[PDB]
Amino acid sequence: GAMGTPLEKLVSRLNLNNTEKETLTFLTNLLKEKLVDPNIGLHFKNSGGDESKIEESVQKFLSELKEDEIKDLLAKIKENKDKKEKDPEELNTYKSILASGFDGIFNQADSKTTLNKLKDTI
């Protein structure tokens, strides 16, 4: 598919640091990892099933949020990640839950309604 990660243009105006970007990268990469499973990307697969659909969704998701809520989200994911990455299997489940929650966006779900899922995972 055609895509050049357009979200990175607005990510720049959000002013994210290494701590934020790593979490965002982690998020996006776990999506491209778990959403390819119809059990996890139920909406993803049935909305398109394209890697770039993720690259669009994350963008449209965060675009309708607050800059400080993006920080809020990433900080939440980060700390959970960082405490669960101590255990690869535990982190794996976490990544799975994250993706299965973000998957809602592909079903015309609101960005905040889907955000609360991610920010309220652990």
Swiss-Prot record:
Signal peptide boundaries: none
Keyword Membrane: yes
Topological type in the membrane: Peripheral membrane protein
Source organism superkingdom: Bacteria
TM annotation in the entry: none
GO cellular component terms, A-Z: cell outer membrane; membrane
Record's subcellular location: Cell outer membrane
Presence of keyword DNA repair: no
Keyword annotations of the record: Cell outer membrane, Membrane, Plasmid
Protein name, per record: Putative outer membrane protein BBA03
Organism in which the protein naturally occurs: Borreliella burgdorferi (strain ATCC 35210 / DSM 4680 / CIP 102532 / B31) (Borrelia burgdorferi)
Full protein segment contained here: 52 to 169 of 169
